[PDB]
Amino acid sequence: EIKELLKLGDLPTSGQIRLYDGRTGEQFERPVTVGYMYMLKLNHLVDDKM
Amino acid sequence: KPLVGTGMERAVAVDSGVTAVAKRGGVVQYVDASRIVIKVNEDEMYPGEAGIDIYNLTKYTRSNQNTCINQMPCVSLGEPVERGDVLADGPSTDLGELAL
Amino acid sequence: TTIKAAKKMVEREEAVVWDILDEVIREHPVLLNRAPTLHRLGIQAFEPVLIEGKAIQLHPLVCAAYNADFDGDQMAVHVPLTLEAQLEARALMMSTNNILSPANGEPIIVPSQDVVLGLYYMTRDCVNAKGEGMVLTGPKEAERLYRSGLASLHARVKVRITEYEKDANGELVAKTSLKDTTVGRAILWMIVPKG
Amino acid sequence: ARVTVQDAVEKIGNRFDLVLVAARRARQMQVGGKDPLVPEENDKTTVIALREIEEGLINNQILDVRERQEQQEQEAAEL
Amino acid sequence: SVTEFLKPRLVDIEQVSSTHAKVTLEPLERGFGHTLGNALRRILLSSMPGCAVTEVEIDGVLHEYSTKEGVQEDILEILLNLKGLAVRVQGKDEVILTLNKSGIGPVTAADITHDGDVEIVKPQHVICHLTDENASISMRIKVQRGRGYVPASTRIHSEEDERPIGRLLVDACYSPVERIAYNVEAARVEQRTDLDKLVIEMETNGTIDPEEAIRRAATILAEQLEAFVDLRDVR
């Protein structure tokens, strides 16, 4: 189902896309996976720890 | 809004008392960042000594964990709302959906 | 002149005090300590370098001894404050002076997952890649050919190595020979010492 | 600068007496008012003390000989 | 020839939209494609002349954690929308714009009092929404030109600019470019082979000109390279 939902859009089916380096500006071999993940900022801010 | 949700998010943000729930479905009369005034529909309105409903949104105030708790209105003027529908998204909410 | 002026300048944090702070921590080590201390390596000595931020940057090869993952572990820092103290911390409690665990002779500086994965990928040779079967003079030319993109990273290549062997005395005999190894191993050879 | 002290452990019997004589040299160099016998590179007293110990011209015996020489010079100047 | 090769030259500033632009550098002999592409991309993403908002002044609200009877969104959303707004100034380096609005409606960029050298890149950019007839908003907006990006915290210099309570500080995030992609392809040379033409697409704020920003970045890179074009031991 996720595969057909991806193929609905123009995104690649394998889920892993070729990525370029930000520093060297060359192509990363072994196409890295990439997506959209939901993340959370924990209630352990550093300004109350240092 | 969280992209990969579980469907249950539509309940936590509603079944709790964090967001502004519609006690009586009606027509939006006055939208403001502080208060929200709704006009009760003729059927749901009481046949005597009745009027319009007012929800006083809570602004930035200290919570029990030194966090901010603020409600943001998510309705437009003249937009009819149903009973139980959300009117203002509280902290970490988006259109009646939990969004941490 | 007095202590009040220095205190006010420190509070203001003028541009003339940062160099003083860099000078006083030129060779003044500090002590890093994990919250649960098990063995001697629970407290180590390190030369501090100043960084703009609110977190303590730690070496990746030492935290394995600390059993300290980076998921939110908080550690403490202490100051020796005495000449005897600074010399002791530089002499005994320093990280370089503690490479073998006091329990077993096995080294505690064993590399972690990231570096070993990188090196494994660097040395895991395939059967066919860019530049399979060519010849390279030295590891420097291998690194040049690799970074130029004209060849892959792992490919069976006949290169020439110049290795050194320690004789009975303190002599390092040199031998140059042609080996058939992957480009990754040849590139990594520029790192290992001659012995 | 200084990163390893194993070469100092080689020249001294152990690490405890090594750090002891190093602390004595550091006291002589910082508050004792003695000049460093090796040209420093903007390093503290501990680093130059460890370097002079590694060079082999300073140890416990040399330090007590120097202390005896300073004491006899002082008592000859006092008279 | 084998030595003393050619230099590229700009030939097109064709824009597919009002902001999404494309440039085509050609020709490049060999390997200079990826080099120039990555270099120009990093220089563009690093720092370019921007004209974002720095300070705001609303007579009604005193602090960004307050409200105001008449506006739909909150002061924080107003600051966010103002930061998202782009504008172009030519003559001076810092300017103050006045925005006065009344009546029910979506208050956008087209409702501000423009000036001579001040150009709004898009008037449809919504700022807030007035949801009351007898409600008005009169605000001042400080816009200064800078380089790179500076947050609202470290920009403080003295303790007097914040003494006026109406003065609110937003993080000056000025960056005309937003995404810079590039790719090399086979160039059309007269009589040769394997010459590379570099197509650089840029999704920007529309404030800066594509050719202007490209030449500015090229000059910056050349000046930085000049540091050791005649390198010598000097302190």
Add this chain to the structure above:
Amino acid sequence: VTEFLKPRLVDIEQVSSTHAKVTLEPLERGFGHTLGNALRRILLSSMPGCAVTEVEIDGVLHEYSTKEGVQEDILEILLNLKGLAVRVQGKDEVILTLNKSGIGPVTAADITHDGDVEIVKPQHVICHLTDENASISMRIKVQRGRGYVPASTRIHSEEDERPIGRLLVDACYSPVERIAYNVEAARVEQRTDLDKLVIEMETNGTIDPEEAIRRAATILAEQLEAFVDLRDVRQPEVKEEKPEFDPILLRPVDDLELTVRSANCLKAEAIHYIGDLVQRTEVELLKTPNLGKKSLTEIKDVLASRGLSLGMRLENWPPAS
């Protein structure tokens, strides 16, 4: 400020006189990475020089050959030849011979000395020769190429004709043998982090490494010359033309931060533009109805606080409407 920071190098270590370690400090937060990457990608491939490209042994016509007279295979011969650097004059292609026999090993000094070429290391050992009965000779052709040409593209050069059965060697026209740039943190009085660049390079010795860095900088500057501001400053010209009438006068009176009451009173007298009001002394205001104290005060405040005043004599109005 739009004015960047220029670094000042403080260390150029020339250890071994053929391997340089240069530093650069300070740079921007991301300039070190891009500069190191550009310099590396230039010196690796796009750096003209000279190197061996053809080899021909008078007795061996294949890379695989059990050749007598030498205790090394042909692969080691090709490797040593590839490791032989030579600088040539304006002549972009030249051949040389190695007619020599003997007991010891043939080195670079045994090449036929020609004024058109120059060997960088005569003592560089080429091939160990059999101590007796070993008279071998081979010719080598060098050219002036662009950079590294691997065997894959080299075997394609063989694929063209190779009519004699010509042997081949990996062409490495780049004078630099290896390069490694590293970025670290550098601190200014209050700057968070600047890119301090450290470049360790090692060349074939045919040219100085600092000279190679200078040549790479010059070639990159010549490449970017097509877009360098079109000039040094490109605008040493400041001309200020300003008419007598101000453009604020053309704008309507509703753009002066005035109340709706005052706006209605101003529109009552059919005075829309500001220029239609600046040419009107206040004598014609308190006679206008609905202009008492609050409205008059607001008008005199919001209009004259901008520098101008109410009531002036001008003739350039309205240009052009």
